Design a protein around this ligand. Sequence first.
Ligand SMILES: [K+]
Ligand SMILES: [K+]
Ligand SMILES: [K+]
Ligand SMILES: [K+]
Ligand SMILES: [K+]
Ligand SMILES: [K+]
Ligand SMILES: [K+]
Ligand SMILES: [K+]
Ligand SMILES: [K+]
Ligand SMILES: [K+]
Ligand SMILES: [K+]
Ligand SMILES: [K+]
Ligand SMILES: [K+]
Ligand SMILES: [K+]
Ligand SMILES: [Mg+2]
Ligand SMILES: [Mg+2]
Ligand SMILES: [Mg+2]
Ligand SMILES: [Mg+2]
Ligand SMILES: [Mg+2]
Ligand SMILES: [Mg+2]
Ligand SMILES: [Mg+2]
Ligand SMILES: [Mg+2]
Ligand SMILES: [Mg+2]
Ligand SMILES: [Mg+2]
Ligand SMILES: [Mg+2]
Ligand SMILES: [Mg+2]
Ligand SMILES: [Mg+2]
Ligand SMILES: [Mg+2]
Ligand SMILES: [Mg+2]
Ligand SMILES: [Mg+2]
Ligand SMILES: [Mg+2]
Ligand SMILES: [Mg+2]
Ligand SMILES: [Mg+2]
Ligand SMILES: [Mg+2]
Ligand SMILES: [Mg+2]
Ligand SMILES: [Mg+2]
Ligand SMILES: [Mg+2]
Ligand SMILES: [Mg+2]
Ligand SMILES: [Mg+2]
Ligand SMILES: [Mg+2]
Ligand SMILES: [Mg+2]
Ligand SMILES: [Mg+2]
Ligand SMILES: [Mg+2]
Ligand SMILES: [Mg+2]
Ligand SMILES: [Mg+2]
Ligand SMILES: [Mg+2]
Ligand SMILES: [Mg+2]
Ligand SMILES: [Mg+2]
Ligand SMILES: [Mg+2]
Lengths: 185, 51, 148, 54, 125, 219, 49, 158
Amino acid sequence: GIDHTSKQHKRSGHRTAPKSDNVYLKLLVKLYTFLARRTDAPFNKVVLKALFLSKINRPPVSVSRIARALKQEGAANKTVVVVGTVTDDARIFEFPKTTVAALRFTAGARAKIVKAGGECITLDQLAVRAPKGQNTLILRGPRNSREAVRHFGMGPHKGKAPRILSTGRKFERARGRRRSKGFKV
Amino acid sequence: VLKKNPLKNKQVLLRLNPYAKVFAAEKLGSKKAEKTGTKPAAVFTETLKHD
Amino acid sequence: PSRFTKTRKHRGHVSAGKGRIGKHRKHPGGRGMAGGQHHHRINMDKYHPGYFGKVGMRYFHKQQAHFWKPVLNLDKLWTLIPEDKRDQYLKSASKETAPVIDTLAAGYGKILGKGRIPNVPVIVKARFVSKLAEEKIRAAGGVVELIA
Amino acid sequence: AKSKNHTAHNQTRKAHRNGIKKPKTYKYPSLKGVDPKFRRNHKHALHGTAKALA
Amino acid sequence: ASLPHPKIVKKHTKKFKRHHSDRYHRVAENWRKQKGIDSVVRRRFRGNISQPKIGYGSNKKTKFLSPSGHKTFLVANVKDLETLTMHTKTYAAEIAHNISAKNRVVILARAKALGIKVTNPKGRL
Amino acid sequence: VAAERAARKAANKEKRAIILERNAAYQKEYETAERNIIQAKRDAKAAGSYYVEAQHKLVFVVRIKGINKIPPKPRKVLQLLRLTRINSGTFVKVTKATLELLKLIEPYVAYGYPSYSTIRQLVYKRGFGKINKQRVPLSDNAIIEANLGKYGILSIDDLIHEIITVGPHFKQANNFLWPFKLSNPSGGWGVPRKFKHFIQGGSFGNREEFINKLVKSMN
Amino acid sequence: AISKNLPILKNHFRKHWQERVKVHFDQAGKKVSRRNARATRAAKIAPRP
Amino acid sequence: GKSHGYRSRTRYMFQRDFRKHGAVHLSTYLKVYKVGDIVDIKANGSIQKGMPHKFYQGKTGVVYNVTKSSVGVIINKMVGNRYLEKRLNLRVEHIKHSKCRQEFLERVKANAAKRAEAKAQGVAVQLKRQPAQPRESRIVSTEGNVPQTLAPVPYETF
RNA sequence: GAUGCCCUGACGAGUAGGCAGGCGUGGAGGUCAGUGACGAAGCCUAGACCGUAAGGUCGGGUCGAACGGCCUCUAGUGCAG
RNA sequence: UUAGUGGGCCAUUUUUGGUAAGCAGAACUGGCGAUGCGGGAUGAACCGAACGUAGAGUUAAGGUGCCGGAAUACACGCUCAU
RNA sequence: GGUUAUAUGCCGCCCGUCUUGAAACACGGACCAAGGAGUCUAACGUCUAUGCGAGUGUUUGGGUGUAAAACCCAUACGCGU
Ligand SMILES: [K+]
Ligand SMILES: [K+]
Ligand SMILES: [K+]
Ligand SMILES: [K+]
Ligand SMILES: [K+]
Ligand SMILES: [K+]
Ligand SMILES: [K+]
Ligand SMILES: [K+]
Ligand SMILES: [K+]
Ligand SMILES: [K+]
Ligand SMILES: [K+]
Ligand SMILES: [K+]
Ligand SMILES: [K+]
Ligand SMILES: [K+]
Ligand SMILES: [Mg+2]
Ligand SMILES: [Mg+2]
Ligand SMILES: [Mg+2]
Ligand SMILES: [Mg+2]
Ligand SMILES: [Mg+2]
Ligand SMILES: [Mg+2]
Ligand SMILES: [Mg+2]
Ligand SMILES: [Mg+2]
Ligand SMILES: [Mg+2]
Ligand SMILES: [Mg+2]
Ligand SMILES: [Mg+2]
Ligand SMILES: [Mg+2]
Ligand SMILES: [Mg+2]
Ligand SMILES: [Mg+2]
Ligand SMILES: [Mg+2]
Ligand SMILES: [Mg+2]
Ligand SMILES: [Mg+2]
Ligand SMILES: [Mg+2]
Ligand SMILES: [Mg+2]
Ligand SMILES: [Mg+2]
Ligand SMILES: [Mg+2]
Ligand SMILES: [Mg+2]
Ligand SMILES: [Mg+2]
Ligand SMILES: [Mg+2]
Ligand SMILES: [Mg+2]
Ligand SMILES: [Mg+2]
Ligand SMILES: [Mg+2]
Ligand SMILES: [Mg+2]
Ligand SMILES: [Mg+2]
Ligand SMILES: [Mg+2]
Ligand SMILES: [Mg+2]
Ligand SMILES: [Mg+2]
Ligand SMILES: [Mg+2]
Ligand SMILES: [Mg+2]
Ligand SMILES: [Mg+2]
């Protein structure tokens, strides 16, 4: 016998591979597993872990978010890398030049980047240009902006959204939501 | 692949501890202490034997 | 498909995953929303506050078309010019040949003011406008023409 | 028929499985319950310090 | 004529027979685990049948080898043989139960030419 | 590639020379300390005084009870001393902070004051390092130098020196040793019933210098 | 029958609803018929639109 | 039936000390609390206003708010398997500065001196406290102190 | 065969229950130009082999017209009560 | 995010009702329930000790006349019971 | 050496079930075959995969067809912005 301080046979609880059966994503993972092992660059370890993430943990990155990032001081000529999809945003007018590396470009995003003189590249083309992540800038989309997150942690006084199909005057605005009808929240 | 005990395997003893060759040669496990002629005080003995 | 369900993995385990003690009986707790003010009060108060009781005034025979007024922010707005013609109009910022943007034709009923437009005059036809949307269009040298 | 009424037997064991977590501290706690007169001024003070490091 | 292997150890030769397959005709011998609340087999009281468990697994070096040292490979025709042309030390061919007597003579002749061991050469003879 | 073997053989030779001189020094240090305690006891006797020896600085602790039916407080203390299995043992630096721990776990442990002989035999026979969360046998001086080199400690005999003198890097040396895994004692425990105090003719609690006979039979 | 944090639902199946389920398996058939009837009508009425 | 009012079970807890009834001495009112100060809560039963609930008796916390007559204190209360933060509004008669902190600060100061003194003098100083150590060796003389022999005594009745 | 190969260390009780990897059955798409009246399927067999096991395979007897392996799809898919 | 559960019971110590109970009711811990294994002849809970499959060694608790593996061991006394 | 039957030593209560507690003087079970119990649907929550992305959804319908398939599509409408 052994007085176990921890739980035995506990899996790490991190993905160690994409759950996806996309062949081409599996090739990207074969590449970045190689570079992460054989270089010392922190970048490659990060990009490798990002290729494992589920769709909800790879939120899209608009081109306005890329544009905002290149306004950072000393950042205008960095390769922006998005381990995921770059979407268009018609809320910006002037987009800078720049090279963006990503898994996917929407048709509109690829148009807007190219029209400004830029270049959209795959993550394997990034590997050859920047094997040690040289001169890159990793961007992540916003995670906590999903509709589902509005509803997490629902409870008295917590200020979260109820799970509700129909909204209006008659749907969950009475006893419990105002002092005049029993009490508020 | 196989833990050898220094305390049995003489080769492994020497690997871990180069002084073991010296220690054995000079027989430091059986060192004679130098004779001294110290005697306890009366008081020490008188209390030792006291009823 | 049936071959991936846990029904298949419970084959041989007596209770089908429902317990020896408690069991899978018919409707312990009552059917549907039974008991919302009695034995299900805690759930209802925690996750559906506001569920019981009335607020506000009735409206008999409400027709939703009366309330049709879809909103467009200025943020967008230039989206309503087609992408071919957009780039020329932005570089040729002219009080003499400003683009007309019929926001009703596009299927909108009110221009709201979120965000920033280019400093390029535009004629905006709309049913309604916010106060700030109008200020921003005029500050770019535009006008709001009201229509019906 | 009659049953057991109450016991805390087994409750500390249950409590210690996922441990008794100390409540987690931040630089900058909420100014919540702090005197409103103080808070109202403090806004005005912080405003001026921004307009000064500029 | 096999690849040299370690002495093949079987940790448990005895078949795992279902509890009470000896007592009732209705209960077949095919292993089933007792799930019952009071079962002496489930609970592992001294004196009762042992249950299959992963500790009895065979050494990976010798798992699947027959006593000859070859792994068996079911063959139905000459083209199925001849997958084993270059693997004679590893694999032995077993002719499938449904091959006709006339087609067994063909498969066996070709087996001899290629030096493939056949595990069941006396079948249908 | 001869010069790679040459330079490695050179540097190795140099490392063994250093180990040789240190081990010779420790030998002297131990013997002088031993004889100075003996002469101090004689000199006091001669003067009609009593030499009161320094209080012990190091205990060795063995867990003597299994892992069922231990109350929460001693169960936590036992985990803090890395004693999570019957017959596992560790060294403990004595202080008020550690003495009050040993009080709490007295019914579950045997402990006392280890000699150099006992420490030498434990580390040579049953010494394993904690390297990268793994239990690795101390089969070469290189293994020790790689992990304790930053604190001096280049060899198994330096590691022993740090333990027995309760050196300034005791903590780090002592934590590096994986808890010793002893057998049951080879001629038994010497008593019909273990689970009473040594003083009452059981096995548990502080048995001072008699820990050495016990542990030598367990190792 | 209330539990967890789920939407309140409004599934109206408290009548004998299985007596009146209409599955539109004839979708493809009704399209062929409608087309034949356009063709037949076109012939009867020709050359009119 | 059972009874669990706000002051249930306080009979002894809120009693005044013996011969220490009556008016609160003035030093209680001249103490100055500042946000971040660590205070110990101990209800004065003579001041019924601003009084802590009996659970907080003997608990220490941090001042988070200062008002006319009172301070806000934060306490961590264990509820179930976790600690919730509680915010109490106590009149100052029920509070006192914790001397735990007062005597820690004296050590921070003393350490600063020692460290400065060590650099200028140009050596190296130990600033961690140590647990009480095993005694070192020592010679005890018997000069005017010859050991006196004791024996166990027989049983007597009284 | 990179879902591969390999090195190192630790660990292994379990009802209710959870999840995982597998075995088996009727039928469907694909494939093996698969097996078969020179004997398919079924059944019997203190004969043999493989698998921790679900199970798989082979020989012998009986028999007479169909049936299997693998990659997938699908369910009226596994019994001691 | 979701399962099961929401009849408990026992031992040491603290403890209430009761003449008491293998009774009723609380406190802290350890257990049984959910658990085999060595010991207590036997036994849910006691003692020891918690369990992948094997080999060797050593032990725990309990034992060593015979049943029964192991001294009809050694030592000082006490005890003869119709 | 395997298997099998037997002998010998030691060990081994009857499963399933409800239960704090079953070998129970608790319940079901004489035996065997075959059948025999978490399904489908409407609307949903979390999570995951996939497509496209400020959009998205061809299948009400129309066009076409090797004809319930496959292929193509306007206007709306839904959800989202
Ligand atoms: K183990
Ligand atoms: K379940
Ligand atoms: K009742
Ligand atoms: K009750
Ligand atoms: K087929
Ligand atoms: K629950
Ligand atoms: K519940
Ligand atoms: K037990
Ligand atoms: K027993
Ligand atoms: K023991
Ligand atoms: K007998
Ligand atoms: K035999
Ligand atoms: K029952
Ligand atoms: K009955
Ligand atoms: Mg189960
Ligand atoms: Mg049931
Ligand atoms: Mg239920
Ligand atoms: Mg109850
Ligand atoms: Mg009551
Ligand atoms: Mg077998
Ligand atoms: Mg049971
Ligand atoms: Mg012996
Ligand atoms: Mg004993
Ligand atoms: Mg009362
Ligand atoms: Mg009042
Ligand atoms: Mg297990
Ligand atoms: Mg069917
Ligand atoms: Mg046949
Ligand atoms: Mg038979
Ligand atoms: Mg026929
Ligand atoms: Mg069925
Ligand atoms: Mg049956
Ligand atoms: Mg059953
Ligand atoms: Mg439930
Ligand atoms: Mg209840
Ligand atoms: Mg119940
Ligand atoms: Mg009772
Ligand atoms: Mg139960
Ligand atoms: Mg007895
Ligand atoms: Mg005997
Ligand atoms: Mg034999
Ligand atoms: Mg028996
Ligand atoms: Mg009963
Ligand atoms: Mg039973
Ligand atoms: Mg009975
Ligand atoms: Mg009944
Ligand atoms: Mg009956
Ligand atoms: Mg019947
Ligand atoms: Mg059947």
